[PDB]
Amino acid sequence: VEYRNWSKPQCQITGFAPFSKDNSIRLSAGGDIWVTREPYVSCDPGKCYQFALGQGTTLDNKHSNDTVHDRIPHRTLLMNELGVPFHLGTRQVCIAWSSSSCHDGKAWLHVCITGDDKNATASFIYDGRLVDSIGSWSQNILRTQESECVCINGTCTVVMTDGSASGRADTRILFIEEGKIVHISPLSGSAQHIEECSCYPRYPGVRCICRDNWKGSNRPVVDINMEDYSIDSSYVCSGLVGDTPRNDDSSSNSNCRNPNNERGTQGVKGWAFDNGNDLWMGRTISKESRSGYETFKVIGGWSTPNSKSQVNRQVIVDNNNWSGYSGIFSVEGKSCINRCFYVELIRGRPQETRVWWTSNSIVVFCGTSGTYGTGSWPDGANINFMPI
Amino acid sequence: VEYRNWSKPQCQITGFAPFSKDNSIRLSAGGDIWVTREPYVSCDPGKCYQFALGQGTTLDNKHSNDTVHDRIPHRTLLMNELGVPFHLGTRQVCIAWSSSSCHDGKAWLHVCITGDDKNATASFIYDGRLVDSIGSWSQNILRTQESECVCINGTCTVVMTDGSASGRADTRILFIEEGKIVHISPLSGSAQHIEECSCYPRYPGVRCICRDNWKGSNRPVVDINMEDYSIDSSYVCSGLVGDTPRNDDSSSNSNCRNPNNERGTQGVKGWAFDNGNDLWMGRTISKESRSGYETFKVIGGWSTPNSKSQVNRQVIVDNNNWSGYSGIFSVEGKSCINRCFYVELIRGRPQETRVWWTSNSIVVFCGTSGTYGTGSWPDGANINFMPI
Amino acid sequence: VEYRNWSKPQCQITGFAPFSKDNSIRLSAGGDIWVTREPYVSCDPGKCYQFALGQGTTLDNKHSNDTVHDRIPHRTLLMNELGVPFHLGTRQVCIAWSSSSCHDGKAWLHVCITGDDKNATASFIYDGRLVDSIGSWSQNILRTQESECVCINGTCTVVMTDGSASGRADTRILFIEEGKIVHISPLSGSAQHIEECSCYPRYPGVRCICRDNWKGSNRPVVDINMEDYSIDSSYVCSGLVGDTPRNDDSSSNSNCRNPNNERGTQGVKGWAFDNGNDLWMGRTISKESRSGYETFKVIGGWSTPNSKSQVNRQVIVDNNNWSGYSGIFSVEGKSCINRCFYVELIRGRPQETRVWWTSNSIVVFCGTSGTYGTGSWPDGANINFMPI
Amino acid sequence: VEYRNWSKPQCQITGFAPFSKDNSIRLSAGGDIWVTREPYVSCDPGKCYQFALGQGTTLDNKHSNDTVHDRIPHRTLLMNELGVPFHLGTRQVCIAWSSSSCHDGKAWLHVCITGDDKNATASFIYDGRLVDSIGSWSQNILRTQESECVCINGTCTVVMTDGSASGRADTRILFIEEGKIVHISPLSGSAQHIEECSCYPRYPGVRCICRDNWKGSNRPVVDINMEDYSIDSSYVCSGLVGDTPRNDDSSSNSNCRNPNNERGTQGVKGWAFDNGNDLWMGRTISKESRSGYETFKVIGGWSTPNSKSQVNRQVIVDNNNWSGYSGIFSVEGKSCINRCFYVELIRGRPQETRVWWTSNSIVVFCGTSGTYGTGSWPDGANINFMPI
Ligand SMILES: *[C@@H]1O[C@H](CO)[C@@H](O[C@@H]2O[C@H](CO)[C@@H](O[C@@H]3O[C@H](CO)[C@@H](O)[C@H](O[C@H]4O[C@H](CO)[C@@H](O)[C@H](O)[C@@H]4O[C@H]4O[C@H](CO)[C@@H](O)[C@H](O)[C@@H]4O[C@H]4O[C@H](CO)[C@@H](O)[C@H](O)[C@@H]4O)[C@@H]3O)[C@H](O)[C@H]2NC(C)=O)[C@H](O)[C@H]1NC(C)=O
Ligand SMILES: *[C@@H]1O[C@H](CO)[C@@H](O[C@@H]2O[C@H](CO)[C@@H](O[C@@H]3O[C@H](CO)[C@@H](O)[C@H](O[C@H]4O[C@H](CO)[C@@H](O)[C@H](O)[C@@H]4O[C@H]4O[C@H](CO)[C@@H](O)[C@H](O)[C@@H]4O[C@H]4O[C@H](CO)[C@@H](O)[C@H](O)[C@@H]4O)[C@@H]3O)[C@H](O)[C@H]2NC(C)=O)[C@H](O)[C@H]1NC(C)=O
Ligand SMILES: *[C@@H]1O[C@H](CO)[C@@H](O[C@@H]2O[C@H](CO)[C@@H](O[C@@H]3O[C@H](CO)[C@@H](O)[C@H](O[C@H]4O[C@H](CO)[C@@H](O)[C@H](O)[C@@H]4O[C@H]4O[C@H](CO)[C@@H](O)[C@H](O)[C@@H]4O)[C@@H]3O)[C@H](O)[C@H]2NC(C)=O)[C@H](O)[C@H]1NC(C)=O
Ligand SMILES: *[C@@H]1O[C@H](CO)[C@@H](O[C@@H]2O[C@H](CO)[C@@H](O[C@@H]3O[C@H](CO)[C@@H](O)[C@H](O[C@H]4O[C@H](CO)[C@@H](O)[C@H](O)[C@@H]4O[C@H]4O[C@H](CO)[C@@H](O)[C@H](O)[C@@H]4O)[C@@H]3O)[C@H](O)[C@H]2NC(C)=O)[C@H](O)[C@H]1NC(C)=O
Ligand SMILES: *[C@@H]1O[C@H](CO)[C@@H](O[C@@H]2O[C@H](CO)[C@@H](O)[C@H](O)[C@H]2NC(C)=O)[C@H](O)[C@H]1NC(C)=O
Ligand SMILES: *[C@@H]1O[C@H](CO)[C@@H](O[C@@H]2O[C@H](CO)[C@@H](O)[C@H](O)[C@H]2NC(C)=O)[C@H](O)[C@H]1NC(C)=O
Ligand SMILES: *[C@@H]1O[C@H](CO)[C@@H](O[C@@H]2O[C@H](CO)[C@@H](O)[C@H](O)[C@H]2NC(C)=O)[C@H](O)[C@H]1NC(C)=O
Ligand SMILES: *[C@@H]1O[C@H](CO)[C@@H](O[C@@H]2O[C@H](CO)[C@@H](O)[C@H](O)[C@H]2NC(C)=O)[C@H](O)[C@H]1NC(C)=O
Ligand SMILES: CCC(CC)O[C@@H]1C=C(C(=O)O)C[C@H](N)[C@H]1NC(C)=O
Ligand SMILES: CCC(CC)O[C@@H]1C=C(C(=O)O)C[C@H](N)[C@H]1NC(C)=O
Ligand SMILES: CCC(CC)O[C@@H]1C=C(C(=O)O)C[C@H](N)[C@H]1NC(C)=O
Ligand SMILES: CCC(CC)O[C@@H]1C=C(C(=O)O)C[C@H](N)[C@H]1NC(C)=O
Ligand SMILES: [Ca+2]
Ligand SMILES: [Ca+2]
Ligand SMILES: [Ca+2]
Ligand SMILES: [Ca+2]
């Protein structure tokens, strides 16, 4: 087996086609299924896997009310082949209330963070063994991407933050070789707050679109140079911004450089990617709630500040249904690298108070150069049919 | 691994021997089992797999009443080794309310259709990644085989239809190489309505026996030329016709060219294959309902219009028990290509109204050159024991 | 991969050591577990598998009362790694109410019999495909070993019977190459009734110890010549006889040649094997009921008519607990071929009438050249804790 | 595949990082999970496995009250990939109420003890077959490590004891090649009572830290010479002693040679390892009960009698939560051999009498040369939510 280089051009896409759906919550009403949140997808050279952070319990289980507590020690990273729901035979890969995973072409790396809020531990597990660990540097919830990391030529990179979720924090970019941290670079550039980066290979480097939880409803961009470990950062140019909450399209702004200070506090994990001057992106349909999901291309969305001309819109989840986190993953084809994404479909609390638990299912779409129609692929569980 | 060519003669069979049964509905009364319909079987060069369209729920689950709705976004293609029932560890391969799958000798292709009735999307997934997609061309339930596609020398073919289920529609034959659509041929010849083709390799080409849902109780034939992409079509010659509904044996007709206009509207997915001038075929025992299943050879059933002399009858499911869809699959042996078939055994609605759900189990038989006896292998569940 | 020849001497054993137990019935009280009977064990070159005939249902399931009926069409052969209980992810290998399985060094052969009592079908499945089939020759419950078949140099042999279970029947020995029947030899010699043979490789031939259901409580022996397909048969010499029912040890007899006519009618599947003049054998502890299980060596038990000197007795299941069928399997070691056995532990009807079902668990022991102690390894379920 | 030699230096660790947690008891309240105790971890050259002794039942099952009885014949060794909870698809590897397992680089060896207290049998299973067995030598609960054995150059060693648990016993060290016992050495040196050794490779030999159940709260050490089979034994030097019960830190003693006669009777399985003059060790936080778990390095803890200066303490389980057995396992890295440990988290009887059963979950930590924070990772189940 050879290391992945991702040294193929990006696939020229026309939109996205349906790829996978796990129906987790529907199944939870008639079977033993893990309570989860913060899912993601990552593929080895042959096939894709779904990941999520378990809550140390199944849904039809009195322990499912534990989701009211943050970052419990029982949270573990779950890993299954994509489309296999999180049943009781699911492997718990590590202890984690925040994680990132990626395959370097030879083996899996898992970054798993657990322990006390003020003194967390990140474990680095490669090829089935613990290779390294790092402690909290700002004593305030050491945390990572909640989506796939990216490896080029045997060096994997992952973005981590420690510090305030509502003010200046300490973001660092780690470079990892076979599980061993070989370099750490501080965040540099004009991004002022970085959470939950959605990263993708853009040979020879890595590009991340993240969540500003402090002053921006425009999404920050982090650019990682894999040759010399240098970091740059800015904000997505698009005037159609990607965060939730955000302003209406008619009053939203981005200048590519600074947080827009428009309903900037809080946010949701999301993604976008460049194609020349243009931008492909997803976001919730609701401006203030994690409801619905849509994708579109913004003409000049990458290069032109405040660009608002969209095309190729697709509804993924209609606005009568709950969404959640979303993130990118990349899949190597015969001649190009394709971009795909997943959407977390959150059910239960806080939005649905009949039940005491919070959990999710997922839906997954992949880039296509072909054609497609329309639809909506929500979680689909009837809240009234669920164990409370 | 090399591409399949299927370039061996067809096995000379005397009838069929029992191969597999999954007992899905019986198990559903005492375990967590997926609600399904439209099952089929396809084998890689080593082993066979069972497929079905899930309804995003298990049977003992309040969501099982969702089967009243057509083409829900929660339908996914399920895939297990043949004989492994659809338990909660089953992989959902893609999002699909219509599908076809096949292995080209190197990897699996799945064709998965989902989305809105008037604007559906077909996704083409090969070797675990999305390679292509196509949108609806007639804005009226883009749909496909519900059984295995066929690949010769790395080119897979699949039959798709879009348009009316009760009048002239737009049927197209797709040619797919490693998941990429390389050519699309319109239907040609005298078949006037094509649904749910059961296709098989007949080197150097592919032959399909389908369902005419409009004017014929005789089954259409589609012949696919894999060398130049040309298409021909007609009707099975046999005066013993394969569709349900149909006339009784004394008043049924086929002229090999046109739909017979005998109880022609509606139908059921089924299969047949040629052996020289003769025809092996299956059908429901009832002429009006999806009850029972029988196979036999029709002497001159391929070459002689209105041929009605049968031999080698076998009851697969007696007429006191429900059947459903049936389809062909092909299995390469040491020196010949064998033909096998599955029968869908539908339980629940509309025939059994004690329950709200509709689901199925399967029974599977394979061609034999040896000898065999008699029996009946129905679903076997007691409807009174079932969750409603 | 090379064909198995079993061309090593037999291991020189001192008794048997515990190998495996599946706890099926205990687990059935708190989990979804298949209803089974007629289990056996067979190993590929690397590891062992447990097999059993399912009843198309789990135990905690209203369909579990179906065991009152004989040879239902829903019975299927189940196959799992040894020690994996028959959970819902278990593969159903074929449709069977009687079976035999074996690995030839390259691939698995399964012999699966199903269908009508008076007109059954035996299917022969090799390397995951149906290769051959044979119909009933005496129109009276075509049936086979219910334990492993044996292959030498790519030819597998299996013993089958058709006809009366309480009078002269028609026993035949089949020789199978890659799933294809290449020769059938009629039973020859002095054995007068043959059921459920427990066979083992004894290079260059195969030896079987079987069940006489007609006139013998001494067990018949069938010797199979793999070179020229010739058959010989007789009875185990030991005056300590292996069948149940049987006479007390003080009044039991065998002359090595004829059925003893001592409580000869009926029986139970069992095993024995030769080592020079001596015999290793198992049997129920009770003379008239399938209760308890014991093994011992009979000095001169192979060569001396009516020999009754035993040594090296071991209790496997004490006589306060139910047993059932038992059979041999052989395992290739570094320098010798070891003999192992399994015991079926039947729970439920007819002995335990609180419940309506009949099912079993298994315990497995293997030959040892070492030392060992004592114990008892019964099913262990409390009948009062079971679903009825 | 080549034999493991473990001929790399020990990794220089700063403490331990979180590796795995299975949440078994929490899951048992909403799923079918095995009742277990005496768990351990062992890895093949690629990945880690969790083992435990089943009680022949799931937790939500009336048979769960069987844990009141000692050493039932239904106890079997369970084996899953690390992090896969013991669901119903778990393989029971052998019959065992005491066990040890290890991989020699080519295949797994399992040592499985079962049968009567006064006459037990140890079975030795290698590469999926029974190779050897030994009977009880002292007729008083033949028993072994309950953690991984160690193999160097194809010879595996395991420590076994037979005789009194509260007085002088007969401890022997076995040397096993491909499942065959090749040599047995009696215990030699100054250790006066040996139970449940936690052993690790210390090339060219093996070192074990055990449990003195008779006169010592200091842990015995067994040194095994793999070249000439010679045995040495002593006690851990550290004045901070590892057993439970024990004296408080101000009044505990060890002289490296003799049991300390300080609350010496009874004990708990535990571990330690040397690094030069220093000692890494774990123990319960409570001095009297199996509550809490802590690790630390003792300066001069290996070489200096009664050394009590500790550094690098970590809480693994806080003292408000139940612990249990703990043991070491070793994992080969690129250039060093790492040490890891597991902690058994016992729930139910005798400490929690709302339920009748006793079971456990696990938490697992691995040596790190990096940095880390703090936390506590207890079982996490709410005893009031459990089936009784
Ligand atoms: C043990 O197992 C073995 C293996 O399974 C059994 O052997 C098999 O037995 C089968 C039944 O006998 C046999 O198939 C038959 O072959 C004959 C030709 O030899 C064929 O005529 C049979 O088909 C007729 O009968 C079946 C019922 O058995 C009907 O379902 C079918 O529709 C056919 O009936 C029609 O044609 C008859 C003859 O013309 C008419 O008498 C009848 O009324 C009916 O007429 C209607 O349809 C006509 C059009 O076909 C139409 O003109 C007219 O107007 C009416 O509408 C059947 O295929 C297998 O060949 C044989 N297999 C082997 C390998 O030998 C064996 O029996 C079992 N043992 C025991 C003791 O039972
Ligand atoms: C974020 O996480 C990091 C990493 O986990 C934290 O850093 C770690 O912090 C640990 C706690 O400070 C530290 O371990 C300690 O090392 C010191 C030596 O530097 C050692 O003395 C400590 O052991 C004592 O204290 C612990 C409680 O913390 C007790 O459980 C233990 O028994 C020891 O107490 C005994 O000795 C003391 C000193 O002699 C006495 O004062 C005390 O009363 C007690 O005496 C009894 O025992 C004696 C025998 O030992 C006996 O003579 C006497 O009679 C009494 O019976 C502990 O090992 C780690 O080294 C450190 N790790 C690293 C990598 O730096 C960090 O704190 C976290 N951040 C925050 C903000 O909390
Ligand atoms: C069958 O399926 C296909 C494929 O999915 C469908 O074809 C796609 O259709 C969509 C919708 O028309 C189209 O995306 C639009 O492109 C337009 C540019 O040509 C954009 O202007 C438009 O964005 C506006 O409308 C959206 C709602 O549709 C709003 O959500 C969005 O905010 C935009 O609205 C603002 O801007 C407009 C214009 O300035 C203004 O009037 C509004 O007030 C507001 O300020 C979408 O991005 C795709 O391009 C089509 N895809 C392809 C491949 O052709 C097809 O429609 C379906 N068939 C049927 C019958 O429905
Ligand atoms: C610890 O475990 C070991 C290993 O399991 C035990 O050692 C074995 O012990 C058994 C029982 O003694 C022994 O097997 C016997 O060998 C005798 C020959 O030496 C046989 O005579 C004897 O058979 C008779 O007794 C059985 C009951 O034990 C009856 O079931 C059986 O029908 C026989 O009884 C008839 O024959 C006798 C003699 O003619 C007559 O008196 C009776 O009335 C009746 O007609 C067993 O086969 C094994 O050989 C031992 N194995 C080894 C390897 O040594 C050991 O006993 C256990 N320790 C303790 C303390 O119990
Ligand atoms: C699980 O936790 C929830 C709280 O998150 C519990 O609900 C509470 O129950 C108490 C006592 O019954 C009430 O006083 C509170 O008002 C409830 N809180 C909420 C937010 O609803 C629930 O009882 C727990 N489940 C079980 C089985 O005990
Ligand atoms: C599942 O759906 C069916 C309808 O498809 C529900 O059955 C209906 O229930 C209502 C209220 O009880 C009745 O008034 C209707 O007559 C029923 N319809 C039919 C067609 O029978 C059923 O209640 C749903 N299941 C659950 C658990 O709510
Ligand atoms: C399963 O089958 C058994 C029979 O094998 C049923 O038990 C019978 O029940 C009927 C009516 O209740 C009684 O008249 C008979 O006496 C019973 N027979 C025996 C042998 O007990 C049982 O009811 C069936 N199970 C279910 C759920 O219907
Ligand atoms: C499981 O075993 C326990 C005993 O170990 C049973 O508990 C006993 O029940 C009886 C009758 O109800 C009481 O008189 C005893 O006092 C109980 N003993 C203890 C130690 O509590 C229990 O009933 C068994 N479980 C089941 C389902 O029968
Ligand atoms: C601690 C800051 C962080 C991102 C802003 O909060 C996230 C908010 C969440 C959210 O917005 O849904 C849930 C995440 N599980 C949480 N992350 C952690 C590590 O607890
Ligand atoms: C839409 C026409 C088509 C074939 C006639 O209807 C089929 C009828 C069905 C049937 O006759 O059982 C069920 C199939 N699931 C359905 N196919 C789709 C795609 O909905
Ligand atoms: C039909 C004769 C045969 C052996 C004598 O009866 C067996 C008796 C049985 C028994 O003695 O337990 C159960 C077996 N399932 C049955 N075999 C078949 C094929 O039905
Ligand atoms: C028999 C002595 C032995 C070690 C002291 O007792 C152990 C005590 C136990 C304990 O202290 O928790 C439980 C172990 N399962 C048991 N071992 C056996 C084989 O029964
Ligand atoms: Ca924000
Ligand atoms: Ca029709
Ligand atoms: Ca008999
Ligand atoms: Ca002690």
JSON list of C-alpha atoms in Angstrom, two decimals, chain A residues 17-23 26-27 29-32 45-46 81-85 87 331-332 334 366-382 385, chain B residues 32 34 55-58 60-63 65-66 72-74 76 88-95 114-116 119-121 123 125 127-130 132-135 178 180:
[
{"chain": "A", "resi": 17, "resn": "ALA", "atom": "CA", "xyz": [-26.30, 13.09, -6.19]},
{"chain": "A", "resi": 18, "resn": "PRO", "atom": "CA", "xyz": [-27.70, 10.96, -3.34]},
{"chain": "A", "resi": 19, "resn": "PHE", "atom": "CA", "xyz": [-25.16, 8.55, -1.86]},
{"chain": "A", "resi": 20, "resn": "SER", "atom": "CA", "xyz": [-26.22, 7.18, 1.54]},
{"chain": "A", "resi": 21, "resn": "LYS", "atom": "CA", "xyz": [-28.78, 7.46, 4.35]},
{"chain": "A", "resi": 22, "resn": "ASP", "atom": "CA", "xyz": [-28.75, 5.50, 7.58]},
{"chain": "A", "resi": 23, "resn": "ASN", "atom": "CA", "xyz": [-32.29, 5.91, 8.99]},
{"chain": "A", "resi": 26, "resn": "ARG", "atom": "CA", "xyz": [-36.47, 5.37, 12.58]},
{"chain": "A", "resi": 27, "resn": "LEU", "atom": "CA", "xyz": [-34.59, 2.14, 13.36]},
{"chain": "A", "resi": 29, "resn": "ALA", "atom": "CA", "xyz": [-37.85, 2.74, 17.52]},
{"chain": "A", "resi": 30, "resn": "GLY", "atom": "CA", "xyz": [-37.56, -0.99, 16.72]},
{"chain": "A", "resi": 31, "resn": "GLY", "atom": "CA", "xyz": [-34.04, -2.09, 17.56]},
{"chain": "A", "resi": 32, "resn": "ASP", "atom": "CA", "xyz": [-31.00, -1.35, 19.71]},
{"chain": "A", "resi": 45, "resn": "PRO", "atom": "CA", "xyz": [-8.87, 3.82, -0.68]},
{"chain": "A", "resi": 46, "resn": "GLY", "atom": "CA", "xyz": [-11.58, 1.15, -1.19]},
{"chain": "A", "resi": 81, "resn": "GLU", "atom": "CA", "xyz": [-19.00, 0.95, 7.02]},
{"chain": "A", "resi": 82, "resn": "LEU", "atom": "CA", "xyz": [-21.11, 3.72, 5.51]},
{"chain": "A", "resi": 83, "resn": "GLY", "atom": "CA", "xyz": [-24.77, 2.70, 5.59]},
{"chain": "A", "resi": 84, "resn": "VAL", "atom": "CA", "xyz": [-24.41, 0.23, 8.44]},
{"chain": "A", "resi": 85, "resn": "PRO", "atom": "CA", "xyz": [-26.40, 1.80, 11.25]},
{"chain": "A", "resi": 87, "resn": "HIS", "atom": "CA", "xyz": [-26.05, -1.33, 16.07]},
{"chain": "A", "resi": 331, "resn": "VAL", "atom": "CA", "xyz": [-13.09, 10.59, -2.61]},
{"chain": "A", "resi": 332, "resn": "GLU", "atom": "CA", "xyz": [-10.42, 9.68, -5.17]},
{"chain": "A", "resi": 334, "resn": "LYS", "atom": "CA", "xyz": [-9.99, 7.35, -11.66]},
{"chain": "A", "resi": 366, "resn": "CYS", "atom": "CA", "xyz": [-21.56, 13.17, -3.55]},
{"chain": "A", "resi": 367, "resn": "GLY", "atom": "CA", "xyz": [-20.44, 15.49, -6.33]},
{"chain": "A", "resi": 368, "resn": "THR", "atom": "CA", "xyz": [-21.57, 14.55, -9.83]},
{"chain": "A", "resi": 369, "resn": "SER", "atom": "CA", "xyz": [-20.64, 15.65, -13.33]},
{"chain": "A", "resi": 370, "resn": "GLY", "atom": "CA", "xyz": [-23.96, 14.18, -14.51]},
{"chain": "A", "resi": 371, "resn": "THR", "atom": "CA", "xyz": [-27.56, 15.28, -14.06]},
{"chain": "A", "resi": 372, "resn": "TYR", "atom": "CA", "xyz": [-30.10, 14.94, -11.26]},
{"chain": "A", "resi": 373, "resn": "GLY", "atom": "CA", "xyz": [-33.58, 15.93, -10.12]},
{"chain": "A", "resi": 374, "resn": "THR", "atom": "CA", "xyz": [-35.08, 17.08, -6.84]},
{"chain": "A", "resi": 375, "resn": "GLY", "atom": "CA", "xyz": [-36.14, 15.65, -3.50]},
{"chain": "A", "resi": 376, "resn": "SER", "atom": "CA", "xyz": [-35.86, 15.90, 0.27]},
{"chain": "A", "resi": 377, "resn": "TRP", "atom": "CA", "xyz": [-34.22, 13.31, 2.49]},
{"chain": "A", "resi": 378, "resn": "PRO", "atom": "CA", "xyz": [-34.99, 14.16, 6.14]},
{"chain": "A", "resi": 379, "resn": "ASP", "atom": "CA", "xyz": [-34.52, 11.93, 9.20]},
{"chain": "A", "resi": 380, "resn": "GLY", "atom": "CA", "xyz": [-38.09, 10.67, 8.82]},
{"chain": "A", "resi": 381, "resn": "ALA", "atom": "CA", "xyz": [-38.79, 9.44, 12.36]},
{"chain": "A", "resi": 382, "resn": "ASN", "atom": "CA", "xyz": [-42.15, 10.19, 13.92]},
{"chain": "A", "resi": 385, "resn": "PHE", "atom": "CA", "xyz": [-43.40, 6.70, 17.95]},
{"chain": "B", "resi": 32, "resn": "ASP", "atom": "CA", "xyz": [-35.41, -6.88, 14.56]},
{"chain": "B", "resi": 34, "resn": "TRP", "atom": "CA", "xyz": [-36.01, -4.81, 8.02]},
{"chain": "B", "resi": 55, "resn": "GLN", "atom": "CA", "xyz": [-38.60, 0.93, 3.96]},
{"chain": "B", "resi": 56, "resn": "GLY", "atom": "CA", "xyz": [-36.32, 2.70, 6.47]},
{"chain": "B", "resi": 57, "resn": "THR", "atom": "CA", "xyz": [-37.72, 0.63, 9.33]},
{"chain": "B", "resi": 58, "resn": "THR", "atom": "CA", "xyz": [-37.86, -2.76, 10.98]},
{"chain": "B", "resi": 60, "resn": "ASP", "atom": "CA", "xyz": [-41.75, -4.68, 14.85]},
{"chain": "B", "resi": 61, "resn": "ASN", "atom": "CA", "xyz": [-41.63, -0.88, 14.85]},
{"chain": "B", "resi": 62, "resn": "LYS", "atom": "CA", "xyz": [-44.46, 1.65, 14.61]},
{"chain": "B", "resi": 63, "resn": "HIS", "atom": "CA", "xyz": [-42.82, 3.09, 11.46]},
{"chain": "B", "resi": 65, "resn": "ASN", "atom": "CA", "xyz": [-47.04, 1.51, 8.67]},
{"chain": "B", "resi": 66, "resn": "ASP", "atom": "CA", "xyz": [-45.06, 3.76, 6.27]},
{"chain": "B", "resi": 72, "resn": "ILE", "atom": "CA", "xyz": [-40.49, 7.33, 0.42]},
{"chain": "B", "resi": 73, "resn": "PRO", "atom": "CA", "xyz": [-37.06, 9.04, 0.68]},
{"chain": "B", "resi": 74, "resn": "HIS", "atom": "CA", "xyz": [-36.13, 6.57, 3.43]},
{"chain": "B", "resi": 76, "resn": "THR", "atom": "CA", "xyz": [-32.46, 2.28, 0.77]},
{"chain": "B", "resi": 88, "resn": "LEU", "atom": "CA", "xyz": [-29.84, -4.44, 11.96]},
{"chain": "B", "resi": 89, "resn": "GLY", "atom": "CA", "xyz": [-26.22, -5.00, 10.90]},
{"chain": "B", "resi": 90, "resn": "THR", "atom": "CA", "xyz": [-27.25, -4.98, 7.22]},
{"chain": "B", "resi": 91, "resn": "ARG", "atom": "CA", "xyz": [-25.49, -2.40, 5.05]},
{"chain": "B", "resi": 92, "resn": "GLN", "atom": "CA", "xyz": [-27.63, 0.17, 3.26]},
{"chain": "B", "resi": 93, "resn": "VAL", "atom": "CA", "xyz": [-25.72, 0.49, 0.00]},
{"chain": "B", "resi": 94, "resn": "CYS", "atom": "CA", "xyz": [-27.43, 3.63, -1.35]},
{"chain": "B", "resi": 95, "resn": "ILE", "atom": "CA", "xyz": [-30.67, 5.62, -1.27]},
{"chain": "B", "resi": 114, "resn": "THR", "atom": "CA", "xyz": [-34.57, 8.17, -5.45]},
{"chain": "B", "resi": 115, "resn": "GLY", "atom": "CA", "xyz": [-36.24, 11.58, -5.09]},
{"chain": "B", "resi": 116, "resn": "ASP", "atom": "CA", "xyz": [-39.45, 13.17, -6.37]},
{"chain": "B", "resi": 119, "resn": "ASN", "atom": "CA", "xyz": [-37.88, 14.63, -11.00]},
{"chain": "B", "resi": 120, "resn": "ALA", "atom": "CA", "xyz": [-35.99, 11.56, -9.74]},
{"chain": "B", "resi": 121, "resn": "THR", "atom": "CA", "xyz": [-32.22, 10.98, -9.67]},
{"chain": "B", "resi": 123, "resn": "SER", "atom": "CA", "xyz": [-27.02, 7.43, -8.93]},
{"chain": "B", "resi": 125, "resn": "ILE", "atom": "CA", "xyz": [-22.06, 3.75, -7.61]},
{"chain": "B", "resi": 127, "resn": "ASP", "atom": "CA", "xyz": [-16.37, 0.14, -6.46]},
{"chain": "B", "resi": 128, "resn": "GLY", "atom": "CA", "xyz": [-17.76, 2.02, -3.46]},
{"chain": "B", "resi": 129, "resn": "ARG", "atom": "CA", "xyz": [-17.91, 5.52, -4.98]},
{"chain": "B", "resi": 130, "resn": "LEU", "atom": "CA", "xyz": [-20.41, 7.66, -6.86]},
{"chain": "B", "resi": 132, "resn": "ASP", "atom": "CA", "xyz": [-22.26, 9.23, -12.37]},
{"chain": "B", "resi": 133, "resn": "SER", "atom": "CA", "xyz": [-25.89, 10.30, -12.15]},
{"chain": "B", "resi": 134, "resn": "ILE", "atom": "CA", "xyz": [-28.78, 11.01, -14.49]},
{"chain": "B", "resi": 135, "resn": "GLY", "atom": "CA", "xyz": [-32.01, 12.92, -14.00]},
{"chain": "B", "resi": 178, "resn": "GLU", "atom": "CA", "xyz": [-16.75, 1.43, -14.24]},
{"chain": "B", "resi": 180, "resn": "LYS", "atom": "CA", "xyz": [-19.63, 5.92, -16.02]}
]
